From a paper:
During the early and late steps of infection with the Gram-positive bacterium [name], the tripartite anthrax toxin is secreted as major virulence factor in order to kill host immune cells such as macrophages or neutrophils. After cleavage by furin-like proteases, the truncated 63 kDa-sized PA monomer oligomerizes either into homo-heptamers (PA7) or homo-octamers (PA8). While PA8 can bind up to four factors, only three of them can simultaneously bind to PA7.
We determined three structures of the fully-loaded heptameric anthrax lethal toxin complex, which differ in the position and conformations of the bound LFs. Due to a symmetry mismatch, three LFs occupy six binding sites of the heptameric PA7 complex, leaving one PA site empty. Binding of LF to a single PA protomer is mediated via the N-terminal domain of LF, orienting its bulky C-terminal domain such that the adjacent PA protomer is not accessible for binding. In the chain of LFs, the C-terminal domain of the anterior LF binds to the N-terminal domain of the following one, creating a directionality in the complex. Consequently, if two LFs are bound, three free PA binding sites are available, of which only two can potentially be occupied due to steric clashes. This results in the two complexes PA7LF2+1A and PA7LF2+1B, that differ in the binding position of the third LF. In the other LFs (1LF, 3LF), this region is flexible and not interacting with the α-clamp.
Numbering used by the authors:
A (entry chain B), B (entry chain C): 173 to 274, 287 to 301, 323 to 734
C (entry chain I): 32 to 279
D (entry chain H): 217 to 345, 369 to 773
Amino acid sequence: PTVPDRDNDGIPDSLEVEGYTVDVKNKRTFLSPWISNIHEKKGLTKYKSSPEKWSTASDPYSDFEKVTGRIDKNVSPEARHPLVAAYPIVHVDMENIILSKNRTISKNTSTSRTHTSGFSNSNSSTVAIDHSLSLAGERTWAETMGLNTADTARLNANIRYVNTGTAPIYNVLPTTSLVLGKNQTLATIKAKENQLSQILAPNNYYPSKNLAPIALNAQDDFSSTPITMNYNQFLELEKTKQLRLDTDQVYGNIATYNFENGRVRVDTGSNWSEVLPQIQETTARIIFNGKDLNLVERRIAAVNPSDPLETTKPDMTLKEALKIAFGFNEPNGNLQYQGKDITEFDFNFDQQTSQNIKNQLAELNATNIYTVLDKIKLNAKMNILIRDKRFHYDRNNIAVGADESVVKEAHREVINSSTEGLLLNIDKDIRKILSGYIVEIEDTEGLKEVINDRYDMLNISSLRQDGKTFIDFKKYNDKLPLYISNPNYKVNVYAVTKENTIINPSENGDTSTNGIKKILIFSKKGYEI
Amino acid sequence: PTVPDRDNDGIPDSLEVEGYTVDVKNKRTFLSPWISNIHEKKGLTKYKSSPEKWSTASDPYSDFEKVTGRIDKNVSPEARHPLVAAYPIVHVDMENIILSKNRTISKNTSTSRTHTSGFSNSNSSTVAIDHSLSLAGERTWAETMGLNTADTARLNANIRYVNTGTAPIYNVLPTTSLVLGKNQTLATIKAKENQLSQILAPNNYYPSKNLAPIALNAQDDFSSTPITMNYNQFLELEKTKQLRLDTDQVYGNIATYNFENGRVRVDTGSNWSEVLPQIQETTARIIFNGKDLNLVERRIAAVNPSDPLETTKPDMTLKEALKIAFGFNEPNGNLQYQGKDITEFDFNFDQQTSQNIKNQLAELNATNIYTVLDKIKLNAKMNILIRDKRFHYDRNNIAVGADESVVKEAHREVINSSTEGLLLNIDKDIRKILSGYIVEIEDTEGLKEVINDRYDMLNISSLRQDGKTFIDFKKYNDKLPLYISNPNYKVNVYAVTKENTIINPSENGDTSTNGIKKILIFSKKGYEI
Amino acid sequence: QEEHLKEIMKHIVKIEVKGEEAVKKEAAEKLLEKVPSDVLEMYKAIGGKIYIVDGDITKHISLEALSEDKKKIKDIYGKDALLHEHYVYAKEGYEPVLVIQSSEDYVENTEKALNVYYEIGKILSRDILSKINQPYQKFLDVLNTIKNASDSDGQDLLFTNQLKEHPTDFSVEFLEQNSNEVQEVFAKAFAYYIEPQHRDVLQLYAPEAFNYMDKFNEQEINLSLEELKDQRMLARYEKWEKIKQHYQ
Amino acid sequence: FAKAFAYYIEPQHRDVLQLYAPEAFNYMDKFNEQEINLSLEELKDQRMLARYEKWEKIKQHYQHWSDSLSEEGRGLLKKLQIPIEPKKDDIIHSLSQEEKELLKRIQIDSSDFLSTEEKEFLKKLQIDISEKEKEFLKKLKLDIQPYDINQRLQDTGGLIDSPSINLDVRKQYKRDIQNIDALLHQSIGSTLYNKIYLYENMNINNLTATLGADLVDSTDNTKINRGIFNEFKKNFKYSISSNYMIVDINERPALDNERLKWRIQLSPDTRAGYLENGKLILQRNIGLEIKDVQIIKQSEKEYIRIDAKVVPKSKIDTKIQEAQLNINQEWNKALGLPKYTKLITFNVHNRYASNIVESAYLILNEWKNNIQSDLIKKVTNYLVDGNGRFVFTDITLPNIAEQYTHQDEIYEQVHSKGLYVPESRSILLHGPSKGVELRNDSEGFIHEFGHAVDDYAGYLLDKNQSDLVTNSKKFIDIFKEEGSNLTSYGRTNEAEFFAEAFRLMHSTDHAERLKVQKNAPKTFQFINDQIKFI
């Protein structure tokens, strides 16, 4: 009669500890104990959970609610599993800025969510402004804008918020402060009031790509020019051309599911700023840049030996974590992510986490973690960073370069070549670590004539509407076709990786591509062209 | 007997899954299990639903209320069926504007709710300003309004709100921002406070057609000219004559039915801005322009394989969806909408949906979807667009033109012809893709004299109060009847559809209709008049 | 809130479908149940029995060949109706027969149930009790109390026009010379008493009439059956059998 | 089996079982909570020591009753156990008149009424020693029956006053049973024992000779034909025993003709007697409800296992009246009869009761759909115009009520598959017996129906005269020519011939209809002419 359920979460004790699964019988859904033979053919996942936790992940959705689907239909699919915390992760993306003096520099920007190292739970992004010259004659920003020693420039940018987490935010929108250099806070972006009545579902923008982005300067009367900026500051900006956007975790309320009638109402009692601390202190954190070289962070519930209540959670071995959080599978029993074997990735651990794993590796007598992967225990609070092993990385764990040899194979497929340009087809991921191309012409006797011989004249590679990259020569040429002094002269094309780029004129203001680390990328004679 | 009912929605479990129907017995209404032979002759619809959802559609009215009628009597009929989500869809319709400088150009406008392509869940419309010259002498707006390089024009428009959805909005009325060009946001029309105390039932206007429309400019002291606009903006406007009206989804509260006394009271806890997200992630979206070439949007509840609870919804086949959502029927077993067979319509799908349907077409070994229609399963989140195959369309899926053959066929019924004009009776739908007519006279030896020989002098076709089209020659003539140099001279008339129209004078300001592709529409000799 | 759903829910959600024709049989049987059983035994004992037809009552073998002239009938309210449209007729003769047209709406509504009970009362007073002349002074005494009473619309409810014009109190001679009018008044009273929703109306406007009928249906109907049986020789003879056997 | 068993006992998995294997759950549900105790005893029932212990534990309880038995009680009981054979010397000495010489030279082997065993009795008398002699033979039959108390009880159904036999014999029978009734004064009820099961082997031919003819597989007598079995189990739900049950104590191997193995549970209130020979005598008029019907295997031979629980007969009796009301109310609307008529009243007091009641819901369905609607109504109207009612029984026809009274002669008794009484206008259908000719039960009805219909047709021609369609010179002759062109049974006489012809012309197999058309063309137009009268 008891069918005991101490945690009072719908699922009985025995089911939670041993394994269960929900499976639809024609139109009625019921919860059943895991049978090995009848469920595997049906493609059902074997769940486990804690008999003493109303929500094993510790986030606001019960063990029962997640797997049954009675839940805010916006929680991302992979987070339906009881061991993956569902919470929001908001960072700010700046699309473009404009400058003037209290002859207007209007440039488009590109941002990437960052993470650096003892790395802590606080969101930040990093914009890097493009250096290429949209206008030929706009050499030296200091003069295109009449900035004087005793002048002040105004900054006016466009931003959108991106939610890369696993749950929706409802009312509030986070406060976020702009910072130049190490600690020079230029401005704190106000928390607009009673204005974010829309929703940020995971992997969405606010406002969507179809609407005007929120103008940063109010354009109202709040402050005439909130973003003033002294001369010396402008200089700092010119040498680094980078800014930082720090955002806090003050989100809104929480959307809960009501059992009596199935209505999802935003309750004003439960607030994410009370939950995040629980999640962040009882889970192991896994950061992965596999999908599109962007940092996707997921959290898995692991046991913490020191705490009675915590020994109840199912032991979680690393191997399963990758399987349920990101999509790894076993075609032939070898862990891989969409073809790419697990061995092409690095494992980096915080100093704390490192020590713990070294112990675990000793009682098993193994040296290569890639073998004993399914035997590694996760404890609470480890932080793990899995990055593609083939690319070079900077201090902020952003993809920045790669070994030249890898770069070459990506170009070994010349779909067509003429005197007007190439329409290549490159793997979408590589063309985000290439700043530009050096074009040069070679005399029949070994001379070398480089066409776009200026640091800020590299942006010659566009992308066609069918995803085929097209390189235009006439852009930084003289609007003239490509000339060849000899049908026997070889035509060489070079690519320049980010790490090896120059961002300002040199010591003696050199603009030549001399001291630039250049990789050989193409070499066809006149006859081939 | 304790008939089982987990979803707690009045109808017992077994009934919902297999099929039921409500039928009024003389004066008492009772719910009955579907009997195949005794109910079909009575023209009753076979309902099905989800045994585990208090509202299969997920909108705020329970499975029981929709079919029984205990519901806000304003919900549109087509939404009474349990599988059609009932929610509001508000867009803004602007009837006419006026311009001046901080001698007022007052032109009437026509607006159509738009939808373009990767199309997202946000309503927007598009106004088009009439280009025809109301005044003879008003050539070149730049001069009719004293606009100088350092001037600013003031904008004062009249707008009305249109509800084309299926449910009422109650207290609030949405904020919406006007934008010219690609990203130039001119103004955001304030959300007047505590003033929309009336109701917007589906297919109604606010304020109604019998009252003055809400003036856009406040006419008060809030801003002297809220719609400021530098000179350069005015130039784009002169070249494009297009404005966009983007509106968000912040509607009011929801009206619920109370069992205790049958009172419909507006509950201040539940708000549409919390429900719409649920609907938009669990339904298939069908857009149809069949009735009057206007975009009607409906949402149907479809299953989602990945989610246990969601497999509970009754399987919905495409053929039945069209039947219950719009009014299609089977006089002879052939799907048709008022005469027009289903075959006269296109099916267009988003890339996801396209891919999904290609699979569906493979396990059945068929190539023409028009046949296997009753075998296509709908899953959640597909988007389908059904447009008339005979008309040409623009990028924003607006009706813009047609094949000449259709244009000629639409005119083969000459009710009357004289020297003062034509009185036709054409199908109401065609005259929404015809911009105007070119009248010309032909000498017995092949000469050609065009009466209204100016680009901006085409709006000569009025409509009489009995729906008979009447073309007036004296309008853009010299207020004189039509002269004919020979009772044997043929009179040729050409029609110009919008897509083939010119909107501004050419390079050298040509006003002749020369380089315009014109379709011949009439040709009777001088004596055949 | 959760409470109310159940009551509405039960009334509307018919769990199973009885059938197309079963409902018909079940409706008629429930109706006749409410009449005290002892009345049915008296009817059977005096001969003919009620048979339920399904179609147009106007055309049935038992009734087609007899009383064609009497096409004019008066409902309980006194308004005239043609027989074909009407749904229940009865006939008094050598073979007392009562015919009721089957329908599915006898439980739900009441105006139709009232006429059936009305016809049972007319058969009872004219065909059963008349064999013993049971309506007599006690019925006449209550009757007399209704005519002379303070503005009692009760008269309007049970008396026809013919009665409203007899100036003095009712006399034992009148009932003998005219016995259709009095028997009718009995029938109406019988009908109103059986139908639950009308019970209150009766007791309200004719208290004494209600009192009379209350004691009559309570403990004065078994006496009707026994006295009726006292005319049948075989009933007397079966009685002799039982008494002699036991104490023998 | 084990897998299914496991899932049901474990509480948490029971629901899983019910969802994916409904049928498996149902089987196991009834298995583990009533049938398992029934299974335990049979295992112990194999050990001779346990059987002996059970028999001994029963003795002492009945020791006092046995020790107090008188000589008259034991002597009476002895007669019940052994069938009593009639003595020839007694009957011969009881005649003494002219009839025996007349009887001396009679064509014995020409009476259909006599049966084989009775012919042998006559042949033994004959060794010692189309007219009026077969009527004298009818009387002798009512005198040569063996004195068998138990046999009398089912034929009369417990109604001991039946005037079906000689008064002196009647007095003799009544005294012996009433004396036996007093003997069974001790109830089984005790504090010494719980549920006790006893067994009895019975021949299927005793319950239904129609099913018994094809129950056993035609080729291998050790297997049972599943097709006929399914019909037999369908409506076997309850039974009543009016006579004296002779039961065993320990199961013993059965004889060839016993294919039913009954398992009867008793109630502490049931009155019963103990026998020293390992048998028990149960009180008469006991009711039994059938809980299950299944096929079992034993010693390489198939059998039918039937369990049963004793309950008060009144509880079963209530089922029969409620069944009576359901069938009569349904057909009054379909026919057009007055609401309150007692038409299909049936009284049954035997072992196969439940099938008889349900079989009514089948004979009439086939009866209506096969005969012209106007004939049924007209004839039913005729039948109601009198006091006749249909009567379905499981006792021999001479014992119901109506038959004996009106015939009035003692020797006028007749028993057979069906019978029609013109005087009382009633149709009698004895379910238990099997027509030596008829193929099923429906045909038995139609034959009796023919006799009744023929009476009304004759009635309509003239009201004052009571006569049949035959005896009119326009039909007697017709029987002399075509009368022998069909079955030999109809050749017997005109009355059976009309009835015989009537079923065939309305048989469900059109072939049979064609046969009667091409073999007796004259009769075919004649029959269509009497039925026209409507």
